[PDB]
Amino acid sequence: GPHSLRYFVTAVSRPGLGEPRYMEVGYVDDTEFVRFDSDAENPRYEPRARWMEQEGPEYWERETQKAKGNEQSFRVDLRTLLGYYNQSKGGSHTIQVISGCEVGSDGRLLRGYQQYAYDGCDYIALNEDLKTWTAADMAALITKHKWEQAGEAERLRAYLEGTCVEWLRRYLKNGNATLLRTDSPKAHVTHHSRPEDKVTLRCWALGFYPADITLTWQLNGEELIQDMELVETRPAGDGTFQKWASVVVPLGKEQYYTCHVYHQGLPEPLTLRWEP
């Protein structure tokens, strides 16, 4: 199926405490694979997945140099935006960007994107057409106007169609044993008493890759989406993910509720129940 290359980038000012913190974190499908952090003792691009050992020293030097240039760009941007919004020098502000591309199973571009926020709100984004921008506000309208006159969108589109997809293909090739694997969830149900002759049933799904999963609880073949509590799917420290979902049910009637787990590594979905 399809894959994505995504960089999450953040620049955060800290007046009185020196230069902004600047970070780039790169993912191929839900797996962290590279990082730059300006606060590191010796800031350089670093591999975050084992298969990135396949890149030569030239990769790390060039991406380090690009990160450092990017860092200086965002430093400038933070001062620029202070003026656009008429804000004082004394406050901390944050710029965020998500940038990258998605390809189909045949390696071809499906979607490119580049979206910026300031202080946690939409700022500007490249439209799906890869030719125009949407600006959330009048500050971002200034940026839009600059990028239009400089041909920034065509520059970005050449990156997205070219470099972004070509490198994503290479990462998928080099990292294939990791990136194209499936790790099947293992599930279980826990039980906790409540006041009022009621009971929490919690369905866990552990050790799975990729992150996409569905957990439901059923009674009489109907899903109880309304009454479930859940946590967002979450990383577990070793490149796998976990999730839980719970339902509150009457004491003595636990045996009528069934958790269902759907996932790529489950040829047939799991059905389980509390087992005393």
């Binding site: 960089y7 790169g26 760009s73 940038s99 972004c164």
Partner: peptide, 8 residues
């Protein structure tokens, strides 16, 4: 793999 970003 990452873009060289433009200033805003």
């Amino acid at each position: 793999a990452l873009y060289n970003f433009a200033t805003m």
